[PDB]
Structure formats: C-alpha cells, structure tokens
Amino acid sequence: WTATSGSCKGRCFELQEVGPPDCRCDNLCKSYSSCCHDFDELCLKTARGWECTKDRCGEVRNEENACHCSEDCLSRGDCCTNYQVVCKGESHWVDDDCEEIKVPECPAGFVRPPLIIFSVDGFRASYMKKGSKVMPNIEKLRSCGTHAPYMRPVYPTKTFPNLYTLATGLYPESHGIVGNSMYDPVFDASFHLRGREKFNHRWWGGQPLWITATKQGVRAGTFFWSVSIPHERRILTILQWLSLPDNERPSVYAFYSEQPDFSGHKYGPFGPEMTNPLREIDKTVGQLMDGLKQLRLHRCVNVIFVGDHGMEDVTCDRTEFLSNYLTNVDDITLVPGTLGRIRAKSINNSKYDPKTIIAALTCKKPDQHFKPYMKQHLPKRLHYANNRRIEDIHLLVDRRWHVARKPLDVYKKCFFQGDHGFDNKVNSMQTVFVGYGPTFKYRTKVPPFENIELYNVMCDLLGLKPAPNNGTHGSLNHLLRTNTFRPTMPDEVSRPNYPGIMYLQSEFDLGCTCDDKVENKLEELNKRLHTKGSTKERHLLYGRPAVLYRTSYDILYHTDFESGYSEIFLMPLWTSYTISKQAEVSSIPEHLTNCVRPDVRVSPGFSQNCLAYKNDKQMSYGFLFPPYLSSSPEAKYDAFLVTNMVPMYPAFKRVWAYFQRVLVKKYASERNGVNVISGPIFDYNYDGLRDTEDEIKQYVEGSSIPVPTHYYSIITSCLDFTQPADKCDGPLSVSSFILPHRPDNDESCNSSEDESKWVEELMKMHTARVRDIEHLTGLDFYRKTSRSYSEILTLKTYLHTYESEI
Ligand SMILES: *[C@@H]1O[C@H](CO)[C@@H](O[C@@H]2O[C@H](CO)[C@@H](O[C@@H]3O[C@H](CO[C@H]4O[C@H](CO[C@H]5O[C@H](CO)[C@@H](O)[C@H](O)[C@@H]5O)[C@@H](O)[C@H](O[C@H]5O[C@H](CO)[C@@H](O)[C@H](O)[C@@H]5O[C@H]5O[C@H](CO)[C@@H](O)[C@H](O)[C@@H]5O)[C@@H]4O)[C@@H](O)[C@H](O[C@H]4O[C@H](CO)[C@@H](O)[C@H](O)[C@@H]4O[C@H]4O[C@H](CO)[C@@H](O)[C@H](O)[C@@H]4O)[C@@H]3O)[C@H](O)[C@H]2NC(C)=O)[C@H](O)[C@H]1NC(C)=O
Numbered sequence: 001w002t003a004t005s006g007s008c009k010g011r012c013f014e015l016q017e018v019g020p021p022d023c024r025c026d027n028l029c030k031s032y033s034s035c036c037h038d039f040d041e042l043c044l045k046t047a048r049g050w051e052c053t054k055d056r057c058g059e060v061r062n063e064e065n066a067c068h069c070s071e072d073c074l075s076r077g078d079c080c081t082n083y084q085v086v087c088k089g090e091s092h093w094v095d096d097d098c099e100e101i102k103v104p105e106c107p108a109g110f111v112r113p114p115l116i117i118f119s120v121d122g123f124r125a126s127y128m129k130k131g132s133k134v135m136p137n138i139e140k141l142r143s144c145g146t147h148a149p150y151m152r153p154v155y156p157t158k159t160f161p162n163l164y165t166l167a168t169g170l171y172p173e174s175h176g177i178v179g180n181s182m183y184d185p186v187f188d189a190s191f192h193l194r195g196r197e198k199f200n201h202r203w204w205g206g207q208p209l210w211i212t213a214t215k216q217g218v219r220a221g222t223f224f225w226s227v228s229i230p231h232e233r234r235i236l237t238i239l240q241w242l243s244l245p246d247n248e249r250p251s252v253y254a255f256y257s258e259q260p261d262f263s264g265h266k267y268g269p270f271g272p273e274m275t276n277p278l279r280e281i282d283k284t285v286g287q288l289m290d291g292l293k294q295l296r297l298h299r300c301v302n303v304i305f306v307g308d309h310g311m312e313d314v315t316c317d318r319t320e321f322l323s324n325y326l327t328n329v330d331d332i333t334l335v336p337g338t339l340g341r342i343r344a345k346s347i348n349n350s351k352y353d354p355k356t357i358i359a360a361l362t363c364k365k366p367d368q369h370f371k372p373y374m375k376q377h378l379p380k381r382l383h384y385a386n387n388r389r390i391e392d393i394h395l396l397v398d399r400r401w402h403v404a405r406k407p408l409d410v411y412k413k414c415f416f417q418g419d420h421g422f423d424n425k426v427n428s429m430q431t432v433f434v435g436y437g438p439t440f441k442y443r444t445k446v447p448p449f450e451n452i453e454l455y456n457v458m459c460d461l462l463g464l465k466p467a468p469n470n471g472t473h474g475s476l477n478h479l480l481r482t483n484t485f486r487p488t489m490p491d492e493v494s495r496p497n498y499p500g501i502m503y504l505q506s507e508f509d510l511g512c513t514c515d516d517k518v519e520n521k522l523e524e525l526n527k528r529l530h531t532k533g534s535t536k537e538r539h540l541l542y543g544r545p546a547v548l549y550r551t552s553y554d555i556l557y558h559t560d561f562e563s564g565y566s567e568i569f570l571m572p573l574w575t576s577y578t579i580s581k582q583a584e585v586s587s588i589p590e591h592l593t594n595c596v597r598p599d600v601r602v603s604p605g606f607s608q609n610c611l612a613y614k615n616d617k618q619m620s621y622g623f624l625f626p627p628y629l630s631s632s633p634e635a636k637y638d639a640f641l642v643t644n645m646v647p648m649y650p651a652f653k654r655v656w657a658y659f660q661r662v663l664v665k666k667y668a669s670e671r672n673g674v675n676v677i678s679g680p681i682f683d684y685n686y687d688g689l690r691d692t693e694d695e696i697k698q699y700v701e702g703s704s705i706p707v708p709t710h711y712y713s714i715i716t717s718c719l720d721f722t723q724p725a726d727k728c729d730g731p732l733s734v735s736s737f738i739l740p741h742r743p744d745n746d747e748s749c750n751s752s753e754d755e756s757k758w759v760e761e762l763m764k765m766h767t768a769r770v771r772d773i774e775h776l777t778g779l780d781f782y783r784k785t786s787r788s789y790s791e792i793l794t795l796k797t798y799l800h801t802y803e804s805e806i
C-alpha cells in the first residue's frame with residue numbers, strides 16, 4: 001500500500017527516496033507506481049514544448065510551462081536549454097570551436113568538477129563513423145575529447161549486466177546480474193525484465209558508484225529514469241539539480257537513453273529507420289551542452305558518453321531448436337535467445353543427465369550455430385561461471401543466431417531484426433566511449449578497453465576511493481590529464497631458492513630412463529655458465545615473475561630457458577624462453593622419444609616420477625620448454641629434465657605439440673622474435689583465482705602430482721617489429737591464451753582433421769589478458785622493463801581478439 005494522498009509540491013525529483021506508505025516524487029516512482037496524485041501535473045509539465053521561440057523571449061513567468069524563457073529563468077535554474085541562443089544572441093555549443101580545457105573553469109562554490117554519465121542503450125561502436133553526418137554534437141565531443149575506437153562490454157552483452165558492470169567495476173558473475181532472466185536456487189526466486197522481483201536488493205551485489213559516492217560524502221543524482229519521463233525532462237532535471245545550493249547539489253549524475261537499442265531490435269543495426277534515433281540522441285546531447293553552457297558549466301563538467309552493448313542482425317529464421325537435437329525436451333528449462341542456459345525442469349526428476357544433454361548437443365549437424373559447454377569449460381576471458389545463478393549447461397550462440405527450445409516458443413511466445421547478448425569479443429557487440437572535460441585529455445585517441453575499467457576512473461574523477469573491483473586501477477590513466485592514480489607494483493611474497501648440483505643420479509628412483517650416457521674444459525666451463533644463469537638475459541626479458549603468495553620454489557637456469565619450479569606442485573609455475581626470427585625447429589631424435597632425466601638440482605622427493613604416468617592409463621606428459629626449439633643437440637637434453645615435465649591428456653598433447661612445433665616458430669617469424677612464458681593453471685572451483693593445493697580435484701593416479709585445469713602462454717615481442725624481441729627499446733606487444741586442459745577435443749568439431757585446420761582456432765577462442773593469467777597463478781609479470789608502470793598495466797589488460805578491423 002502507498003497512501004498517495006500527500007503531494008509533490010516543492011518536491012519534484014527530490015533526491016532521497018522516502019519510505020512507504022508516504023507517496024514518492026523521485027525519478028523512479030512511476031516504475032514502482034507510488035507517485036503522489038499530483039506528480040504528473042507538477043513534475044511532468046509539457047506545456048509549450050522544450051524550445052524557446054522569439055516571441056517567448058522576455059515573457060512573464062507562467063509556472064505551467066515545461067520550461068521558461070522569462071528574464072528570471074537563469075536565477076530559477078529552469079530556462080529552456082536554447083534560451084540564451086534564441087533570446088540572448090548566444091551560439092549553440094556545437095557551433096563553437098573546440099578550445100582545450102586545461103583547468104576546470106567552475107562557478108564559485110563548486111568543490112570539484114561534476115561528472116555526467118550520458119549512457120546510451122544499444123549504441124554500436126561503428127555508429128561513431130557510420131552515423132557521423134547526423135551526430136554533430138556527439139562528433140564534437142569525440143573529436144575534442146578523449147575517445148576509444150570502441151569499448152568492450154562484458155558477457156552476456158545484455159543491458160542490465162553491462163550497466164551494472166559500468167556502475168560497480170565487477171564481472172556479472174560477481175555483481176550477480178548474470179542475465180536478463182535469472183533463477184536463484186538459494187532464494188528459490190526468479191528475476192525477470194518485466195516485474196517487481198528485480199527491485200529486491202538481494203539480487204544486486206557489489207558497491208555501485210552512487211553508493212561509493214554517498215559513503216564518502218559526495219552526493220549523487222539518482223541514476224535511474226522511468227521510461228515515461230521524456231528525454232527533455234531528464235536533461236532539464238539534471239540541469240535543475242546542478243543549480244541547487246552547494247551543500248545539496250550532487251557531484252555525479254546519469255542520463256539514460258533507451259535508444260538506439262529500441263529501434264535496433266525492430267529494424268536491425270543499420271536499418272534505414274536507424275538514422276532518426278541517432279539524430280534524436282545527438283539533439284539531446286546538444287540540449288545538455290547548451291544547458292551546461294548557460295550555467296557556465298561547459299568547461300567545468302566531465303562528460304562521459306558511454307554505451308552498454310552493440311546490436312547485431314538477427315531474424316526469426318536464424319533460430320536453432322533444441323527439439324531438433326533432444327528427445328526429452330520437456331524435461332528441461334531453457335533460458336533462450338543469443339545465449340542459452342539449461343537446467344532440469346524438476347529437481348525431483350533423478351533421470352535428468354547433464355552429460356547426455358551435452359553429448360546430444362555436441363557437433364550434431366555440419367553447420368550447427370551454437371556450442372554447448374559446461375560453464376567451467378567456457379573461455380576464461382568470459383569470467384562467466386562462479387555464480388549459482390549461472391546454470392551448469394551453457395550454449396554459446398553464433399553471432400546472428402538464436403537458440404530456442406521448440407518452434408512454438410518463437411511463433412507463439414517476424415517481430416525483430418536486431419539483437420545482442422553474444423560473446424563479448426564479437427565486433428557487432430562492441431560499444432562506445434568518449435570522455436570530455438577538464439580532467440580528460442584533449443583530442444586524444446586511446447586503445448580499446450573493457451568496461452570493467454571505468455568504475456575506477458569515475459572514482460578518480462570524483463576523488464573517491466573505489467571499492468574492490470575487477471578493473472586494474474591505473475590501466476586507464478592514459479585517458480586523464482590529471483587525477484591519475486599512481487599504483488605501486490605488489491610486493492613479492494616468496495623469494496626463490498637457487499639450487500646447485502646436490503643429488504647423484506642413483507638417488508633417484510623415478511622409473512625414468514633416458515639414452516643419454518654418450519658424453520673438455522672448452523664446452524664444460526660453458527654448460528656450468530648456462531646452469532648459473534649466463535644466457536638468462538636472453539630468455540628472461542622482463543625480470544622474473546613475482547610470486548605473490550607463500551610457497552617454496554626454485555629458479556632453474558638452462559641454455560635455452562629459465563623456470564620457476566614449485567616444490568609444492570612438483571612442476572614449474574612458469575617457464576620463460578626467447579625464440580628469435582632466425583631460430584630453427586628440429587625434431588625429437590628417435591632414441592630420445594621417451595627420455596626423462598632426473599634434475600640433480602632438485603631432490604627426488606620434490607620430483608615427479610615416470611611410473612605414475614605409466615600406471616595412469618588416462619594421463620600422459622608434455623614439456624613446457626619445447627624440445628623442438630632446442631638451440632643445439634646438446635642443449636636438447638635439458639628439455640627432457642623431469643623438472644620441465646607437466647601432465648597432459650593425450651588429446652591435449654595434440655594441441656600443445658602443434659603449438660610448440662609449428663605456432664611458436666610462426667609467431668617468431670611474424671613478430672621478429674618472441675618471448676614465451678608458459679605454465680600450468682589450477683582453477684578447479686572456477687572462480688578465476690589460483691587454487692590452493694587442498695582445492696585440487698585430480699592427481700596423476702597414485703601420486704601427489706596435481707593435474708592442471710588449464711595451460712597458459714604469454715607471448716611478447718616488440719611493438720615496433722623492426723626491432724627483435726630480445727633488443728626492444730620501446731613499447732611491447734603481447735598476446736596470450738589460457739587453453740583448457742581437456743581429455744577430449746569435443747569442443748573442436750574438426751578435430752579429426754589435421755591440427756592445421758583446428759588448433760589455432762581453439763587457441764584464438766581461448767585468448768586471454770595477462771591480468772587474467774595473473775589472477776589464475778598469483779604471479780606478477782613485467783616487473784623489470786624500461787616502461788612506465790601505467791603503460792605496463794595497460795599491456796596487462798590487453799586482449800588479442802582476432803576479429804577483423806571495425
Ligand atoms: C572481481 O572482484 C571481486 C571483488 O574484489 C572479487 O570478489 C571477491 O573475492 C573474494 C574471494 O573469492 C571474496 O572474499 C570472500 O568474502 C566473504 C564475505 O563476503 C560477503 O561480504 C562481502 C563484503 O561486503 C562489504 O564490502 C565493503 C568492504 O569491501 C563493506 O564496507 C560493506 O559494508 C559491504 O557490505 C560481499 O561483497 C559479498 O558479496 C557476495 O555475496 C553476495 C551474496 O552473499 C552477493 O549479493 C554478491 O553479488 C557477492 O557474490 C559473489 O561472491 C561470492 C563470494 O563472496 C560468491 O559466492 C558468488 O558466486 C558471487 O560470485 C558477501 O556478502 C568471506 O566470507 C570469504 O572468506 C572465506 O574464505 C577465507 C579464505 O582465506 C577463509 O579464511 C575464511 O575462513 C572464509 O571461509 C569460510 O567460508 C568458506 C566458503 O563459504 C568455507 O568453506 C570455510 O570452511 C569457512 O567457513 C572471502 O573473503 C569477496 O567476497 C568477493 N567479492 C565480491 C563482490 O564478489 C573477484 O574475486 C574478482 N574476480 C577476479 C576473477 O579477479
């Protein structure tokens with residue numbers, strides 16, 4: 001019950017949402033239906049429209065009008081946005097030349113430049129170029145300010161997951177808004193787009209920017225706007241808030257446009273009908289900026305123009321049906337569309353089997369336009385698993401397609417030509433970022449970045465301390481003229497041991513053999529030098545990785561590679577090596593095919609053993625530093641050391657061998673040398689963070705050798721590829737991946753073909769940021785370069801996406 005008998009008199013768009021059953025006057029009461037009886041009459045005035053005309057100039061104040069053109073309207077903070085233009089011979093903001101804003105030019109009583117977040121739904125990154133002719137205000141913001149060619153959303157690329165990521169700097173898995181429809185089994189409750197469950201606080205985790213602001217004494221405008229409040233009114237409200245007294249006036253504000261998403265769904269992203277929504281958005285921008293200029297705030301406020309996601313061509317005819325794959329379709333519940341999530345229809349049916357559902361959906365038709373995954377097997381770059389609202393079975397749908405349970409769900413539940421929600425690497429899902437204002441750079445382009453990073457920067461812009469989030473604070477300092485955040489590198493927690501020769505070969509009883517007893521002060525002073533670290537400057541180019549947790553490990557040097565060898569996990573945490581453009585691939589000599597050699601620097605009790613592999617019929621082994629890339633026949637023996645071995649399913653050894661025998665050399669040829677760091681990852685609880693030893697669910701049978709869930713590689717080179725990787729004077733270039741360590745290649749539908757037709761495509765799918773590998777290993781990379789730490793942070797957040805050029 002809301003006793004709506006109170007009144008909005010003097011309270012229109014009041015900033016504290018007062019508790020029931022007193023009636024409300026805030027920008028959300030319509031959506032809750034709790035507004036006072038007189039909310040429309042007093043707060044949603046429309047009379048005379050939104051623009052001054054010549055005849056209203058000077059007019060006598062009439063409180064009925066939507067906005068005013070009377071002499072006192074500036075004092076009142078409620079002029080029409082074009083008042084000064086029509087009535088006082090001023091220019092529109094867009095017609096003025098841009099002039100660098102080197103310092104904030106703020107009215108008296110402003111303690112900090114306000115932040116206005118101008119968010120647009122469904123604003124595809126390519127609109128900036130393709131719509132440029134009809135968006136002059138936006139184009140001015142973009143060219144005069146700081147802009148990225150695009151900004152990457154999170155997955156799933158739906159509205160609420162992305163807006164609330166923008167507000168919290170968290171992945172959906174962590175904030176808890178994981179889709180537009182959700183079931184939470186603990187609450188036993190469902191969340192939906194239409195309805196009232198979605199207004200319950202328990203859905204929404206983290207700390208959004210308006211709460212961060214409030215808890216630190218910065219006031220905030222209310223971020224949300226009911227759909228029936230017109231855009232003009234939203235802008236006038238913001239500008240009226242900006243006229244409040246100092247102690248009552250917010251520092252941060254948001255506007256939201258439901259366009260161009262609304263039209264995009266109906267017409268497609270580039271439908272002829274899409275010109276007018278772009279024009280209308282631009283006009284709204286124009287109203288804000290003319291309004292700010294009237295208040296003398298246009299060289300004071302920092303404006304961010306930001307989208308939530310793009311929009312792709314999707315029609316009813318490109319639907320796949322689960323009824324064409326499964327016979328028991330009535331026993332499942334599907335969350336459908338541009339992604340799928342499947343769970344059992346009833347918890348009391350113990351005949352439902354996830355394994356057989358996945359098998360029925362795997363590679364069943366030649367052109368199949370979705371791929372099923374257990375959530376923990378999704379690409380790690382999606383960070384889409386650690387939440388109980390994410391069902392175990394997920395379908396990743398190809399761009400331009402839908403998935404549905406049965407045809408009747410699509411014809412009785414075509415209406416639409418656009419949609420979004422797909423993999424956040426897809427070009428059509430990318431969206432926009434422009435920053436304009438005293439705190440942003442002038443006429444600067446920056447590289448694409450992910451939306452998880454913007455919370456930190458908004459916090460910076462407002463003088464706030466960010467709550468703990470998934471951005472990397474400092475990676476976006478290059479967007480800012482001032483207020484940078486100057487982070488320090490984390491402290492190394494564990495120092496390495498540097499073992500020398502300590503064990504005789506007969507101490508080892510590992511069941512390992514090698515044909516290596518076929519043996520000179522010349523080249524034996526030489527191998528002693530390689531074992532003390534003499535080639536290490538060539539193979540460890542950016543310092544040793546720091547270990548950021550408590551553990552016991554050894555640095556091992558060799559001619560061709562350096563490793564950090566964990567005595568706890570019995571294998572390297574990391575292995576580092578450099579492959580020049582000139583390096584040659586060699587094969588594994590026949591007599592060395594099964595060679596494994598004890599490492600006399602490491603005790604038997606801290607070594608793997610060959611017998612465990614012999615007795616584990618499921619599990620084989622691989623090497624981190626590849627024997628194929630050995631610099632010499634004699635150096636090759638180092639690669640067969642038991643301290644360079646790692647457990648690998650035979651099916652995974654197909655991928656890994658191709659990476660090591662063919663791809664590495666191809667990259668070194670293309671990039672003018674590469675530095676490679678590779679290692680294992682253990683993430684059995686799928687939280688994106690390094691497991692402790694007591695979380696490992698699988699060991700090589702009979703042993704304490706833990707089986708990795710993933711293998712990584714970080715591949716670094718010179719951004720200026722006319723310089724070789726090992727003699728680079730400036731910025732670096734990186735690509736990385738996090739390959740799932742699976743006992744089958746069911747993910748790859750073409751895996752019975754030659755590796756040259758499928759392996760690299762798998763690796764592309766599992767592209768990763770260095771930061772993602774950091775979380776997964778407790779390691780910190782690039783500790784010693786000649787670059788600024790901020791530039792390194794940016795390199796660590798880079799994702800190589802392998803899409804074509806937008
Ligand atoms: C991306 O960034 C995020 C944010 O930094 C990273 O996520 C963080 O990761 C930490 C490790 O996984 C995790 O620490 C947890 O915290 C547990 C307490 O959590 C509750 O309180 C949180 C704090 O709120 C307050 O925050 C500020 C200060 O920062 C205060 O001033 C305010 O007053 C705030 O109220 C809160 O954030 C958290 O929210 C989650 O849960 C809510 C529902 O309960 C959701 O609404 C919300 O969306 C969050 O949901 C996500 O996270 C949970 C895990 O918390 C997960 O279940 C969901 O799937 C979803 O992903 C909570 O309300 C604390 O209890 C944990 O401690 C245990 O572990 C330590 C290990 O050292 C033990 O020593 C200790 O004994 C304890 O063990 C006991 O429990 C075990 C397991 O239950 C049990 O086995 C054992 O035997 C013991 O009984 C731990 O510290 C942060 O909570 C988490 N934050 C968020 C927001 O998600 C994330 O990792 C990043 N991702 C990547 C890839 O880097």
Ligand SMILES: N#Cc1cc(Cl)cc(COC(=O)N2C[C@@H]3CN(C(=O)c4ccc5[nH]nnc5c4)C[C@@H]3C2)c1
Nearest residue numbers: 031117119163164166167199223224225254255256
């Ligand atoms: N997060 C975030 C965020 C980040 C940025 Cl950058 C911009 C914005 C501006 O978004 C809005 O104006 N929106 C208005 C639309 C309709 N709507 C609701 O009615 C609603 C939804 C959740 C609620 N929880 N509690 N009340 C709620 C009301 C939500 C939609 C989005 C939000």
Ligand SMILES: [Ca+2]
Nearest residue numbers: 683689690691
């Ligand atoms: Ca983990």
Ligand code: NA
Nearest residue numbers: 513514594595
């Ligand atoms: Na052998």
Ligand code: NA
Nearest residue numbers: 745746748751
């Ligand atoms: Na396959």
Ligand SMILES: [Zn+2]
Nearest residue numbers: 122261265420
């Ligand atoms: Zn939409």
